[PDB]
Design a binder for this molecule. Structure first.
Ligand SMILES: *[C@@H]1O[C@H](CO)[C@@H](O)[C@H](O)[C@H]1NC(C)=O
Ligand SMILES: NCCc1c[nH]cn1
Ligand SMILES: NCCc1c[nH]cn1
Ligand SMILES: NCCc1c[nH]cn1
Lengths: 321, 121, 327, 327, 327, 327, 121, 121
């Protein structure tokens, strides 16, 4: 191994001044830990495999691959692959640097590393929480243009991605796609970009049930005032005010979950609709009390309010679903 | 400062249940161990158990024969010796170990010890 | 006692030593024995579905290149000599973030043996992911594992085994989790096949049983008291419209606040937990109580006593069915 | 295509090269051209008065010691060669915490030119402090700057200039802040004099306009609804003492909770913000409404209708004056 | 004053020096004396069951390989020389995260002596785990320890002792914990046996007594005031159904909020704390008060005065029993 | 302009240079002059009792080993040359966490002089502990210090002095704390004696005066408004039992919530702050108001007007005494 | 964009109070400085003060003789010159400095300047 | 700025209780120390105590004989000298130390000192 390293120029790509180095790339997604819509980011741990041919390291007399450790990595030239949309990333170095270099007699190098990266994912919360999000993972050479390094997904990518085996607490990976953009020119020269697109569908279950049902029950609580006698002024007034205040606090608390969210979410729309009904119920009794200062109004409201709320619910659910 | 008193020995030809009552700062010593010392032989580890969680460990010789459990209400740890053998003739002690005092199997790691009951079969 | 002689012996061992090549390179795989001395399990997080583990990780293997003669002692060298020696590329497959303590020096031990056996110890604090089934929460039982695997060397080059059999892992009794108890631990050895090849695997798993004491005081008892509070309205006269309506409102509002707070302390799972079922059941009773008075108020402009015997009886039946199902 | 010839050329360049000495040491200052490609502005924090910026920082200078002949190509070398080359000591004066990405390698680019020109690129994520004037919050406009300066070399040794004039900074359109919009950006070049000497300075500044859409839904609308809620008491008969008093209490309490929550999301500034003025005004109206009924209750043991026409009229006037002043 | 002569002396000492070998390798164990100068205890966390400690850690040992003659001075060398010298592999067994300060240089001191004695000082900030018994919280007393042990060298190769006896640890008076007071500190030296061998152990322990002043104002006083607030209902006429019922509801709801808030600031322990017992007792009194009026309302459609003399008397007895038991 | 000649001169200086030995080793102590250019004070934390400081730390000393002749210029070298030069072991005694900025290179400056004078500058962000007396909070005045000391070298080997006298520290006017104002800063030089010896000490202290503007709006004003709200019950007729009781309850509950929230934003100190006294006083008035109606209700089954003139008069007297005492 | 107007000079043989009124984006320029320029001599720093906090600095020559204070209501910074000397004969200017513009004592760091008042004693 | 006044000396042949009253910025000086100086001999450390927490330290000579305690209400630190010996004939001083002023046993670390009371037995 010392003979091969002797005379090896680390600062130069193989065939400098010649055809660009063809680097095969493969991904093995291990997990997707966090998917934060508040921070517009997701955390992914992946095995990154890079394969290329370096004729300077071709050897003789041996047909067996030279399985080498991470200590030999610093001696060789490596592609400067970086994640374009990574907020932060780092290597796993316990108990040692999780790096692999397997050298073949023809000069083909297999380079595998285990990295965990926090990747920014632009999310549209218009239909939140009934929203489906798409997140990307862009891979690109930082300093070498298309004249020096060319990337392409390896043939084994479709079999080792492991995205089907992933289990996500709140989302479900519906579809995934491996795209190659050969027409990216950021600053100087063309930089081929390998992108991994996967679609996340937020799970609809008890999570959405927690937000919507109490809002419905607050509206239901306001309906109960209709069956209460109009002479019970403190009782119906107290029922009206408490539901309105609870709705107001719920709206403030719900938006506080995503502090930097200057968008109209479907959950926010539902709270606005619920607030109108609870506020109208108190106004409905106020009109009845003012008329007394009426009985038909309460009877009509017992049928109009539940019917109107059901109708607007159908419109709300049909549009967003 | 932990005080240990053990009882329930005697001589038998069978099933026997030793016991060990603790008192004092038992929080700083959450592990109780059982040791026996044959005449001339070095003191031998029998089994250990934690006050909280009931996690237990046993030696190979007494594995599947002796059972150790404790009740925190009485601060008592009891060793149930079943299927006795003539090799089980030694003075049985009760000991307590600190939180960061090391391995269970080594008697020198334990700070407070009981009087010791002689059992002969 | 001849330090110069020992220095010459060690310098001879490292002369020509190639860290890039494993012992018996190109030949039989090197067997690596592993033992773990657990120090503590600091945290178990349901929101992040991971646990923090501190342990003494020790590796045993024989390297004939390091065999020495004439010194009937085990050479305990400085930890900095590990950079000039070959060590297994052992990594934890399910860890999320790990490090080796380095105060006052790196928590690392190298101990050579005359036959070439090498003892390599590390004190590692690791955060390992552990998927949790919260359907029976907080009466659930969890199985968290720690996967140990070689990164680069396949089974043709390296083999793993628990040194000492079932006694390879010690210190389980040292685990003091306020919320969990260690029911059992297991040691598993197997081979895992990937695209790159087959790799040895060592697995250490714990079965954790959650303690119900905290949740009885925090969630279950307050929910019951609010439900009992709603029953007070039955003994209050129907003419006290303000009093009975206020009783119904406040119990319902308090029940909602408890339900919202609990779900914020857990991951946004789509399925219903056991505790959620209890809170939903308690919300039904308080909501029915307020509806009960509305029916009484409606007919007025015997029912109360009839309601006095139904709700406590039904609530007791609901509790009996709930606890029997989940215990 | 002769890698050996290129290797000899590069080895010749680095033979005798002294990284401790700047190009043209002891002579004219070396001109360094800078261009920034903004990637994103992740966060803008009012509490910490800082913003997070990710960008591609590129430096352009000529070093005749690195000039090479016979190769009609631009040598794109490995980023690890930057440790053997002189680079400007460029630092950001107003940054609070910054780092260079290092996955899978350090995000660094070295590109030599036949005439000795060196291109040095870095992908840097920086948190730069930005003092904010919150008097007109949330209808305020902020000017956040990024100061670029040499640390050790004075103007006699180094000079900075925006390479490309006003086009030196690109990617401003990529900035997608949910709460802000980039009104304008400016490039400033000047010299700053300290005790140690005069240093070159490059400044990049953005003018941010806050979006009012979030605050209308979160704070302004709930405050208005509570104020309208207090007006319901006027239509309620005066004999309903419990009802009208409860309406006054709850509106006042709800107004206080909104005011307290808002101030906890902002730094403890001593001056009054625009939003604070609106909340104080809304609190006055609800407090006067409760005082209005107390006056009615006192005289009883026409006023209500007179109060019905004053508060909505006065509140509308208050809103009209408030919005015109701050818009 | 001859720097060249000193340079030659030091170069002679490090010529042939092997950092991989401990002093007197293969012979008697080297005795290492340790002193600690406590700087501060920044935090004591009940939720994480750990404390943060900053200290000056100093180690004393003699290495005859570093003995020099002809210089009647103690050579205070640069801290970077410690990388070329053997140092003990001292680590803290119960620490969770520790580091050595490195501004403006590494907080490290090397001071040689003519006889070969080496003084090695480090400024270390460490977070050490400390299991806490919260049964008597907040009137509890805690014993937090700091375990010092060698990682690789057994008792056959190294020995630890407190240099200066009971005066080895200083700066205990500098500890200023707002919530705790340092009752006593102890120094313990012993040997700990593991599977790999027997290792020396030094333990530094503090007994902390919690201050009750904060908890009286934060939790105890508000709970008492709410309980007294419930007693106001007894002096209110029974016909005021809305008033007395509202009094009972609000006191119960406020009591629940206080109980929930307190338990969220502490780890989810399964046992009942002393403060939890007081909150449960206070909740019983307010709940009984609301039940008392329901009984009065039921019989109506003397009891109040009889209830006026029981609850304050019983509550005073409950407080007297509670405080005597826990003090 | 002869780079080769400069390279030869610098290589001659570093040939035989021993970083392990201080200048004039074994002779007179080397005097180190220090200047600080404050950049900003980012945060002042009462809970953690510390502040974050960013500054340009510069050290001046003469090393005759680095003296050069024939070059009438000050050699501004690359910051990486500092690793081959001796630098003082300056550390901050009261810091909790500090670092040196390293973007795009380490924020470090080396500037040599013909006579051997060395200028060493560092941009350091430090978090220094500052014990605070919160008895007069939020009307308190704090004195936070920054201790500068040598770690290894005693007064026999090194001496510290403020270069420029009282003008050594600049940039104090740049400090923009929203909650504090810099009343005064002082420079102190003294010697501190430890067990290891006597060490030089430089201290930089600031006197901070807290701004009352935030606390008036956040805490003081809401408390007054609630107290005024309780006075509304006096004008309400006594027959409105539900209304007046509800007024008393809600004011008391709101007062408790404000008191609880404030204490959660401050460390759990055992003594009573000035703001706590005001909240306790406000709680007494609202509690007495509810007790006042209970007395009125009790006697019924003149007092109100008599109570109308007492509480506002007493509350005004309480405010007058409170503000005069703490101002 | 900050506009500076200064007034209150004149000729005296005493106590004098100069003033300087500011208008515009004063937030971006929180530091106000006073400078005087003797005929032929370079412009000399007199004193500086921050808009917020009232922190002030003075030169040695004018130390303990000149006092500088400001009122934010009028956006005015005033220099009170007491115990005048014949050396205090120069044109007094008013200047504003940016947040990151460097040291106070150097006039080139200041961006906006006033007209300048001539004072002779 | 801390002022220290000590009293309670006199001449005895026994138990004696010295006292030391403090006033001023006692928060910045939380440690109070006691020192005695024999004629010709260097000033000797006796004992130290913190204002908050009551943590105390003593010299070996006066260990188990002298007791030091303080009351924060009067801002007074008192030294109770019991079982007196002829070696305890020196001028007793009272001193205060800063938070980061170093070790307790070294008088030069203390900033403010009392007058000093002469005690002879
Ligand atoms: C391989 O080895 C042979 C025999 O030593 C030698 O002639 C040849 O140059 C080497 N390299 C290649 C590429 O064949
Ligand atoms: N870039 C140099 C900054 C500085 C501060 N003080 C002196 N110079
Ligand atoms: N310091 C050695 C700890 C240990 C654990 N297991 C064996 N040894
Ligand atoms: N700077 C030395 C600190 C110290 C503590 N103890 C002894 N010395």
């Amino acid at each position: 191994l010392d003979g091969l390293i002797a005379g090896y120029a680390r600062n130069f790509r193989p065939g400098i001044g010649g055809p660009p180095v063809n680097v095969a790339l493969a991904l093995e997604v291990a997990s997707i830990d966090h998917i934060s819509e508040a921070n517009m980011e997701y955390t992914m741990t992946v095995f990154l495999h890079q394969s290329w041919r370096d004729s300077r390291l071709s050897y003789n007399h041996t047909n067996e691959t030279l399985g080498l450790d991470s200590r030999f990595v610093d001696k060789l030239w490596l592609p400067d692959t970086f994640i374009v949309n990574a907020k932060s990333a780092w290597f796993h170095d316990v108990t040692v640097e999780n790096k692999l270099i397997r050298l073949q007699p023809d000069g083909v190098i297999l380079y595998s590393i285990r990295i965990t990266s926090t990747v920014a994912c632009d999310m549209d919360l218009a239909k939140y929480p009934m929203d489906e999000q798409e997140c990307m993972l862009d891979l690109e050479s930082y300093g070498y243009s298309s004249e020096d390094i060319v990337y392409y997904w390896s043939e084994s990518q479709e079999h080792i991605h492991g995205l089907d085996k992933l289990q996500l607490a709140q989302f479900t990976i519906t579809s995934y796609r491996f795209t190659t953009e050969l027409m990216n020119f950021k600053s100087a020269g063309q930089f081929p970009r390998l992108s991994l697109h996967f679609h996340l569908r937020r799970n609809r279950g008890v999570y959405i049930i927690q937000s919507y049902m109490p809002s419905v029950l607050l509206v239901a609580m306001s309906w109960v005032s209709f069956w209460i006698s109009q002479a019970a002024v403190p009782a119906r007034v107290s029922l009206g005010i408490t539901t309105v205040l609870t709705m107001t606090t719920l709206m403030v608390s719900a938006r506080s979950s995503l502090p930097r969210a200057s968008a109209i979410k479907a959950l926010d729309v539902y709270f606005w609709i619920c607030y109108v009904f609870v506020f109208a119920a108190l106004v409905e009794y106020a009109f009845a009390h003012f008329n007394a200062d009426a009985d038909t109004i309460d009877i009509y409201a017992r049928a109009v309010f539940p019917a109107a709320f059901a109708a607007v619910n159908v419109i709300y659910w049909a549009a967003y679903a | 400062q932990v005080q240990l008193v053990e009882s329930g020995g005697g001589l038998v030809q069978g099933s026997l249940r030793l016991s060990c009552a603790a008192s004092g700062h038992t929080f700083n010593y959450p592990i109780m161990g059982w040791f026996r010392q044959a005449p001339g032989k070095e003191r031998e580890f029998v089994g250990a158990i934690s006050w909280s969680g009931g996690s237990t460990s046993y030696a190979d010789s007494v594995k599947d024969r002796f059972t150790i459990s404790r009740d925190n209400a009485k601060n008592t740890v009891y060793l149930e010796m079943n299927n006795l053998k003539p090799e089980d003739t030694a003075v049985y002690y009760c000991a307590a170990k600190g939180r960061y005092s090391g391995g269970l199997y080594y008697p020198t790691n334990y700070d407070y010890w009981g009087q010791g009951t002689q059992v002969t079969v | 006692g001849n330090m110069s002689f020992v220095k010459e012996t060690v310098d001879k061992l490292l002369k020509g030593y190639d860290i890039r090549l494993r012992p018996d390179f190109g030949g039989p795989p090197v067997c690596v024995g592993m033992n773990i001395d657990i120090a503590s399990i600091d945290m178990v997080s349901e929101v992040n579905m991971d646990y923090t583990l501190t342990m003494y990780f020790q590796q045993y293997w024989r390297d004939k290149r390091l065999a020495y003669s004439g010194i009937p002692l085990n050479l305990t060298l400085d930890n900095r000599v590990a950079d000039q020696l070959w060590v297994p590329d052992t990594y934890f497959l399910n860890d999320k973030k790990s490090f080796v303590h380095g105060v006052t020096v790196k928590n690392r031990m190298i101990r050579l043996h005359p036959d070439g056996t090498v003892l390599y110890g590390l004190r590692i604090t690791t955060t390992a992911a552990c998927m949790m089934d919260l359907r029976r929460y907080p009466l659930d039982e969890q199985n968290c594992t720690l996967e140990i695997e070689s990164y680069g060397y396949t089974t043709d080059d390296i083999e793993f085994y628990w040194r000492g059999g079932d006694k390879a892992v010690t210190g389980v009794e040292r685990i003091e989790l306020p919320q969990f108890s260690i029911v059992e631990h297991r040691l598993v050895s197997r081979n895992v096949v990937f695209a790159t090849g087959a790799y040895p695997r060592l697995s250490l798993s714990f079965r954790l049983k959650r303690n119900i004491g905290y949740f009885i005081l925090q969630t279950y008892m307050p929910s019951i008291l609010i439900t009992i509070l709603s029953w007070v309205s039955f003994w209050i006269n129907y003419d006290a419209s303000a009093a009975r309506v206020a009783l119904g409102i406040t119990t319902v509002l308090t029940m909602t606040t408890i339900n919202t707070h609990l779900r914020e302390t857990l991951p946004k799972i789509p399925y219903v937990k056991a505790i959620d079922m209890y809170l939903m059941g308690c919300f039904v009773f308080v909501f029915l109580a307020l509806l009960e008075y509305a029916f009484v108020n409606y007919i007025f402009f015997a029912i109360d006593r009839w309601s006095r015997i139904v709700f406590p009886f039904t609530f007791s039946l609901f509790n009996l069915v709930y606890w029997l199902y989940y215990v």
